[PDB]
Amino acid sequence: NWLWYIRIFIIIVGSLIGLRIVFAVLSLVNRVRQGYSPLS
Amino acid sequence: NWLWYIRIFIIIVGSLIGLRIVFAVLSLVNRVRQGYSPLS
Amino acid sequence: NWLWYIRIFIIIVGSLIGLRIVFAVLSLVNRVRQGYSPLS
Numbered sequence: 349n350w351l352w353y354i355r356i357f358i359i360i361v362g363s364l365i366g367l368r369i370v371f372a373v374l375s376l377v378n379r380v381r382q383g384y385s386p387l388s
Numbered sequence: 389n390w391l392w393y394i395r396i397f398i399i400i401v402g403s404l405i406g407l408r409i410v411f412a413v414l415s416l417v418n419r420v421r422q423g424y425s426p427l428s
Numbered sequence: 429n430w431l432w433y434i435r436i437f438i439i440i441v442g443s444l445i446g447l448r449i450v451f452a453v454l455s456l457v458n459r460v461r462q463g464y465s466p467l468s
Contacts, residue, residue: 354395355434361402362441368448371411375458378415379466386420391435401442408448418455419462426460 358398358402358438361398361405362438364405365441365444365448368405368408371408371448371451372454374412375415375455376461376466379462379464382416382419382462386416398438398442401445404445408445411448411451414452415455418452418459422456422459426456
C-alpha cells in the first residue's frame with residue numbers, strides 16, 4: 349500500500365532532530381557575533 | 389482502529405521541529421534579558 | 429522485526445523534540461560562558 353512511501357518519509361524528518369544538538373555549541377560561537385551591542 | 393488517529397499525530401509532531409530554527413536569533417535577544425548577573 | 433517494532437520506533441524519536449524546549453534555560457547558564465572570551 350501507499351503507507352510505505354508515507355513511512356520512509358518520517359525517517360527523513362528523524363535526521364533533522366539529532367542535528368539540533370550543535371545549537372548548544374552555537375552559543376559560545378555567537379560570543380564573536382554577540383561581541384557587538386544590539387543594532388551595532 | 390487507534391493506528392489511524394495516531395498516524396496523522398506524527399505529521400502534527402513533525403511541525404514542531406522547523407519552529408526550533410528561530411532559537412538561534414533568541415540568543416542575541418536573551419543577551420539583554422539575561423544581560424543581568426545570575427541570582428540563583 | 430515486523431512493521432509493529434518499526435511503528436513504536438518513531439514514538440521514541442517523538443520524545444527527543446519536547447526535550448529541546450528546555451535549551452532556552454541553557455542561555456542563562458551559558459551567559460556566564462558568554463561573559464568569558466573564545467579559547468586560544
